[model samples]
Target chain A: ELVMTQTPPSLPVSLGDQASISCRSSQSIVHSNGDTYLEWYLQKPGQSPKLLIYKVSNRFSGVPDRFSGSGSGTDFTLEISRVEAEDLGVYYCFQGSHVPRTFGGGTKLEIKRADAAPTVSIFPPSSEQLTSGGASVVCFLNNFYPKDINVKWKIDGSERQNGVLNSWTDQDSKDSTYSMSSTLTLTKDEYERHNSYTCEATHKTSTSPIVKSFNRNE
Target chain B: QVQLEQPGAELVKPGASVKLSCKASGYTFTSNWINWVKQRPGQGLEWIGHISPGSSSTNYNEKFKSKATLTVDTSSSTAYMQLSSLTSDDSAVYYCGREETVRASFGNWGQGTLVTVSAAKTTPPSVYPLAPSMVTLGCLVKGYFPEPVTVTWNSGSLSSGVHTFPAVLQSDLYTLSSSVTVPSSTWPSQTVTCNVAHPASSTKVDKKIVPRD
Candidate 1:
């Protein structure tokens, strides 16, 4: 049985803004045939949950265009733009790619107003741990106002590209704010020799890009 | 679009049973599958079973296979679940949800129907031990009944380390178990009694436990 766990148990959003929810599967939801069976749903209080997205990234009929799906395999994301009051409720991610289909516990998107800038941090690779395959470092941008933001990574002061990149957006239902996270994966050699890796977050409200670095020595 | 209309509530005696109704509308009743779900007070949802009106076929959760009988009336566009051997634990809010295979999901749900059991009863509590010093006691209560029962140890003086497991549902009844550890030296002088205070009854149902040494 594949387990699905959702992040940011609850989200608070204001009317006419963007909100994002994430669903991580225990295993790849992609079948051997190369198709992924993943879906998203919204459950308002006192009513049944309705399907909004299906098969990885397609919106169901009549679902607003603001609601979009993205990601692949085990890491999937559901983003709702211009979130309305009607979107207030519990959002769940369901995976039908395997037997005994499972659902994410649920992430409630609450309606509220925006507050301050996003908090940023980076998690770097460790030296004691040796991996034959590769390693992954994550950037966490939490409690930020306005969902518009960009995340980029650099290795040894030069912009690093080519590795797998992914992100998950969220909101604080109570404060009407937003949070986002991005992950960067590097091969064993790239992770071992890199002297410094930096994560930069550019936000709509803040002109100065928030920066966090992971140093090999530290 | 599919809609399910369920009954408001049902009251049953301890020995009696009740049949729940869920009427569907807005869509072809026989074209889709209907599933019954259970929600006990302060507990999460449990899928009881589902029925196909077209073929009159049914699938059930292993736990409810014998307790719930699922049926459908194509004429009235209604699905029913008859719960047998009612008990207090059987009391819960039941709903009928429509399953859509296009999305492979349960998309719609009916308003819950509350079922309350008025009679309360319990089977004799059994007490044993892994070792002579450690004693274990358990009980299975049958017959339809209501909630809020008092399970006491040694006439209400429960030990500090006594453990009571969550009640298990079988048919319309409940089974609860508890155990405690006592020093072997005190085994001979210790008397273990399980007392349950039934909601409606003025007197208590007391069962004495004699460990199999």
Candidate 2:
């Protein structure tokens, strides 16, 4: 079983915030070759963590459906409806259900605006603030696990296949433990307002999603 | 009014082993999950795991991976823990606990067994105090019981503090009280708190006192 362990960025999180971390498989399906295997976990500060989602997007039997998962093949997602007050901790993702399986380092969520906010704040786990209407947009891969990984940037509907990636790894450890971060900085004009951007990270030796060379490979 | 009657002490040689038992009385054993705990002389409590005689499947503290195994014979309301490779470090007392939920906390406890493992088997020697002291120390621990029960002095917590003598063990099932005496002049003047953990739904009794004059 592939395990993705994630802790909230902070404790006692409020509503309308990203507080979940997801794990995806590089390969498609095992038995069906269409159903990927993934698992989601929640770690409370003082108590042992619990399994929330498993088998790609299949929620555990007793877990509330408020927790949902999306995406497919190497680029998957595990989402929370509204980050609950109790949902304050780091979140992580794992793609190690297959060979050379791996896990996302973990994302920490913080309460940005809690004035008159819901007492038991609840939020999803994928919202990050960005600055738009600048000179231009740029992609820079700061640090990430598995060492020498791939980083791609997609601005609006166009593919920044060869966007821009400056990668570095100061410290790395065993199969699932590493200290690294990835950054994609873009400058969009107010005219380019409400435009959607997505970052796609692929692995080296994995074939299903082997799009490498942040600037050259497609 | 539930009581746990446990063996006082046992003497075994190195590389040998022993299995201690806790027999419960006064309450129905089928309603709760029975747990086991292993504590060293100066260490924290580790939950060995729990057994729901109902399912027979158990959860364990990965730390006790190889050192401990828990089993229960529901046919007899008796729980057992078999310890292997007896050593001095494993000399501490082993306790049986009951969990009111799927998760467990220290609640009802058994009078721990004092087992000594060495090269040769010797009589269970009682603890004593060297005489000729300025003042006699008094340590009294009192508890109330609605039925027959035993209050045993845990050997693991009793051996750490400085004293000119080995603390004595006193128990009572009928009157519901236990007491111990220490020579005040030989032992340091520090606080020794007394705690009473029971299965009562509303409370677990714990008292901290500097001891009286």
Candidate 3:
């Protein structure tokens, strides 16, 4: 059986903006019958998940043309163009190619005004606290606008992989925009000697990637 | 214009049962499917089950198959969920939603009903000794109905280096276990506790720690 997980757990978007969410499955969703059974659905708060895209890219009947899907195998993406008020809801990726069909932990798209780019801050998990023989750091992206934001992890100015990332909506704010955070784990030695840990945030509202770097001492 | 109206709250005694109702209006109730969703305080949502009034078809989450029974009344345009063998763990908010169109999207939702199991507690956990100063702490959570719970190993300021095994099913009950290698030297002096939390109970279950020789 395949398990699905979605990223950027929540998204905020302004009207007429473009938003994209990613869903990754634990194994290939391509079936032996030569079909990809991955699907995209949207569930407004208090609603059931409604199909938007089926079998990778085909839109469901009556779904708006603005909603589109692309990708293959284990990785898939759902893109919404010119975001609409009706699109404010949670989105999930479901794989029917395998037995015991599974759904991705949902991603919510919220309606917010396009105002500002998110501010960035990075906090290493509790000053080198050890968890199961490993250490982790959390990068916080706050008060971003237009809802489509991306975060990348770098160690000593080079791209790093295998970092576990997650995000959520800011609970306290009254506006429609949101804040997000992701955790990056590393070996103890990498935590001690690393020169700089950079969280580069890219968004359509900003011209340059908003880079926030932290040193070992801070 | 579909609307679902549900009661505000329910109070039931332990070992007893209660039935919840959702009345529909402004639309043909039999044309759409009605589903039940549960939410415990400070926790996420869980889908309990769904029922179609027109055809009387029912579907349930595996966890709620034995705990919740879905029924509908085409005459009254109403839906119901009967929860039996109530315990403190069964206390939570429940809502009824209506599927819109021919799709699975629940476009209309009723106000939530708070189901509170007023009395009785779940089964307390037990700790048994494994040879050579090792111990297997386990708890059997019985449910006449489906209720989510959190079991934690509480010692003095202990947070890391402990991973509780996933809860396994034994008939209608869920069994959970967590073991720690307590060397003989520090076994008797250090007091360990298993804390079980469920929405039905007023207070958490904190069982005492004593190794069964």
Candidate 4:
């Protein structure tokens, strides 16, 4: 499998300034057909990732000219200039040039703002979950800035990848900040064995993710 | 029989520093140069640097200029790699190899030293009868970090019919099983040992199935 190393987990950019993200592949991404199968996408808060650049340098249909892609072989770059308001989000690079396609670790683009790292909390499963031999829990992210944020659920310090769904970010009319939530459902065995369910909130404001753990005993 | 020996694994932390030692054997260490290579769990190899023990001369990879510091102990025939300012991204298996800059190759290499905090939860091998005259010896390894494990059978590192399934992520950790099939007639006469090595966790376990039990 090809691995793409993306730089600058968080990038700060002025409103009209530019931002560049480097995504370098461990091996050449140029396919045997002589075409480089690299792409770029922007993931806005609560929104699906939207394609920006495709096949090394071509802009995806309807994507603005402000976004450009360059580089070749094993190195690639995505440059977004005259950054617009909608451009403030997490950007990711992907390669489909090999047997198993790979995606780069995303880079969150930060625009000038009074940003706050999201406040996180985990909500326990309801009465219905107890009887179904499973647990459906929610991790809430409240009042975050620039709208881009990510959340993870950890059961007793180990990550749970399945039964996870995150909602889109909603801006508060009063505070003008963003809020979102993600849920992780678990089997009966998982719920019984694991006591602590934790929510890790990742935002652009801080280097480390803020953690909120829910102890059923407490 | 030139050999480079390294630790099986290391438990690391973020923002911390770790110094790895590679001891040389059956070779003239003072006249040779030892080089370091880094490969994150599934990433490509990157040459970190090389150190000549004789003259204490060294050359470093530009990307790892500040990340890796090389040193050697003449008396112990040991080379050290002090990796500083670590992060989760810096977690990788490091190897010490004989430097051959002319061909960009390595003649002798140490067993990789995996750096990660994820420990191993390995179970003893279980025996199950199968196919009338055949039996399977199974080893199950679970709750380790991001997939880099090995399992072998018997003395002399036999792998004739050994098979390991791909690891699956249970949650934050990875889990997998490996099995070796041997004839039932062959087992009672000879002892079979199942060896499981989780380098990132610094564990090499061997479970022996005796002649009677």
Worst 10 residues of 1 chain B by lDDT: B123-132
Tens digits of per-residue lDDT for model 1, A1-218 = 67899998888666887888899999888765666878887765434567788887887779899999999868899999788756777888877666555678788777766457766656553221233354656566666766678887888889876653444333333345555545565677768787888889888777899888867664
Give the residue spans of candidate 2 off by over 4 A: A1-218, B102-104, B124-213
Best by lDDT: 4
Query: Local error of candidate 1 at B187, Å?
Result: 75
| Ten-residue stretch with the least lDDT total in model 3 chain A | A124-133
Whose lDDT is higher: candidate 1's or candidate 2's? 1
Of the true interface contacts, each candidate retains a share of 0.10, 0.00, 0.00, 0.00
Of 1 and 4, the candidate ranking higher by TM-score = 1
List each model's interface RMSD.
Answer: 19.2, 26.7, 15.6, 17.9
DockQ winner between candidates 3 and 4: 3
Residues B1-213, model 4: lDDT tens digits: 877888876776667789999999887889677877776653435557778899888877677888889999999999999988778777778888764322222445787787763334432222211111765544444457634566667754566545444555555655454445578887767777767676654566776644311
Compose the digit string of candidate 3's lDDT tens values, residues A157-196: 9888684445445322334555665557567777777877
Ranking by lDDT: 4, 1, 3, 2
Q: Which candidate, 2 or 4, would have the higher TM-score against the true structure? A: 4
TM-score for each candidate, following the candidate numbering: 0.47, 0.32, 0.43, 0.46
The digit string of per-residue lDDT tens for model 4 on A1-218 reads 67889898888776678889999899887777777878776655423345577788987657889889999888899998787666767787877566444568778776665778765555565443466575666665666787778787888889878877555433333344566656575776778777888889889998898987777674
In model 4, the runs with Cα more than 4 Å from the true position are A1-218, B100-104, B117-133, B145-149, B188-191, B199-204, B208-213
Tens digit per residue, CA lDDT, model 1, B55-103: 9988776778778999999999999999999888888878787877655
Q: What is the interface RMSD of candidate 2, in Å?
A: 26.7
